Structure formats: C-alpha cells, structure tokens
C-alpha cells in the first residue's frame, strides 16, 4: 500500500507545473492509477533487460533502454 506515499500535495505541485488553476477532488485517485500503470510497463521492460544480462542489479541503462523502446527517450543518463 505504498501508492499512498505519492501524496496529494505532490499531485497538486505537478498539476501546477502543468498550468492547472483548479483541481477537482477525484483527480488524485485516478492519477495514482495512471502512474502505477506507467511504472509497471517500464519496470517490466527494465527487468527483462536485467534478466537477459543475468544481473541481479537493475541499472540506469536498463531504464534508459526500456524508455527508448517505448518512445520516450531520456537525455542525461547514458547513450
């Protein structure tokens, strides 16, 4: 039940960066589900790259490659 540690204030600050002026009370519980699905898909790919290498440690390159396969390339951790 760690998903509760993505707290309402953090959701508000994220909506502020995106320009949202007013937020309905139901948004937080929907946003946790959307985040959880995104994390699940990325971690499943990262762990598949970790498994193929026979490593036990997950590494930044595994995450950058999982993001690259999925279309969301990230600059500043590798290449």
């Amino acid at each position: 039940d760690n998903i509760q540690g993505i707290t309402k204030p953090a959701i508000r600050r994220l909506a502020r960066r995106g320009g949202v002026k007013r937020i309905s009370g139901l948004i937080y519980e929907e946003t946790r589900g959307v985040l959880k699905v995104f994390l699940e898909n990325v971690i499943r790919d990262a762990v598949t790259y970790t498994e193929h290498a026979k490593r036990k440690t997950v590494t930044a390159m595994d995450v950058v490659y999982a993001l690259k396969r999925q279309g969301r390339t990230l600059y500043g951790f590798g290449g």
Partner: protein, 107 residues
C-alpha cells in the same frame, strides 16, 4: 611522411577517422565510401554549433557564465525547427517553458 589529420584537411573539429570506424563497425552496410564520414561529421558539427550558440545566448540572458541543462531546454523549445526535430526527447533538470492560458488570467 609527416602525418596530418583528415579532420584538419577537411577543416573540421569532429573526428572523421572515428566516424569512419564507427560506421564500419556499426553493421549499416558491407561497404562505406570515403566521402560519407566527412559529410556526416560536417552535419553533426553544424547542428552542435547551432544548439550551443542558442544555449550560450540563453545563459547570457540570465547573466550566468556557465551553460546548464536549463539553458539547453530553453534553447530547444524556443526554436520551431529544433523543437520539431527533438519532439520526443526529455531533458533531465530541464523543466518547462512559462505558459498560462489567457482564459485563466485575472479579468
């Protein structure tokens, strides 16, 4: 017999010899011609110089003297051609451009 680099003969700063090696070992084709790495290096140098000239002017506008990732994000997202080339890319510590919809401002 005095060696002189192919980049100096081309008038370039990027390494033509490394680009040639990296094409040969990249499994792109079984043959690579002599002119391909000079062209690709000159293109890569052009795009690097455009990015850094804009980033440095963004640093000068903040009265800073060192480029940091924020200045690269400002350099890219304010140019309508670089933003189309780098549309799928996330820059760490980059943040966002300041932007508010006119409907939201005070009446």
């Amino acid at each position: 017999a005095k060696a002189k680099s192919r980049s100096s003969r081309a008038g370039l700063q990027f390494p033509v010899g490394r680009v040639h090696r990296l094409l040969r070992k990249g499994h792109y084709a079984e043959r690579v011609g002599a002119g391909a790495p000079v062209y690709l290096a000159a293109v890569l140098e052009y795009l690097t110089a455009e990015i850094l000239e804009l980033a440095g002017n963004a640093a000068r506008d903040n009265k800073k003297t060192r480029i940091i990732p924020r200045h690269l994000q400002l350099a890219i997202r304010n140019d309508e051609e670089l933003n189309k080339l780098l549309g799928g890319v996330t820059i760490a510590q980059g943040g966002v451009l300041p932007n508010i919809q006119a409907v939201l401002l005070p009446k």
